[PDB]
Amino acid sequence: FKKVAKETAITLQSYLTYQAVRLISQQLSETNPGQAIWLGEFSKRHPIQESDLYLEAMMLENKELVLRILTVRENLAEGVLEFLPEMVLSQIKQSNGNHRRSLLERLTQ
Template sequence: MDLKQIAKDTSKTLVSYLTYQAMRTVLAQLNETDPPRALKLHQFTLSQRIENSEPYMEALFHEDQALAFRILTVREHIAEEIADVLPEMLRTSIQQANMQQRRQQLERMTQVDSTPDDWPVGEEISEPQEPNSEA
């Protein structure tokens, strides 16, 4: 397990996600202030793959430099705002998700079949009789 590579891959994924969130934020702002430009950004995003943010941003710089800078600024702001709480939130979320998965698996493993194969179907199950204590 190469933890350094895992960290790099995670960081790349997080940067792409923050780029996506920044684009959504800018798009929402533009929808209120400049609908034609919002449509332009929306159409651009449909034609480009934002999942890999750096090629997306490079293409956006060629298309509309001001929008690209705006998204970079918002992305950086989001990153700064979440940087302090993200590590603990990540640890807690993973622990809670793991606990939930373990709990569900334990419940599946310990479920008792309420109708065992050796119970007669359609017949009532009688209570065991106590021995007669008159002797």
């Protein structure tokens, strides 16, 4: 399923961008409040959903912060990605079983 895989990987990359930004925001609130609010204001003007454009914009407005975001995103990716295939497949099987059981019990009782 090449198309599905490619679209999912793009989605996953954007989502890990969002997670990296979330972590940095938390850290900034404790160590650099001025930057925490700057990032808050930037995120209101640029949708993180469009992550490539988000990062390219910040490259022009705050290069030091985007480099931190890119470093944190790669560390997150490296740490968490290989957990996902087993977690997601096991979650989906369990969720499929629960819904099939719920369905079977309606039809039968």
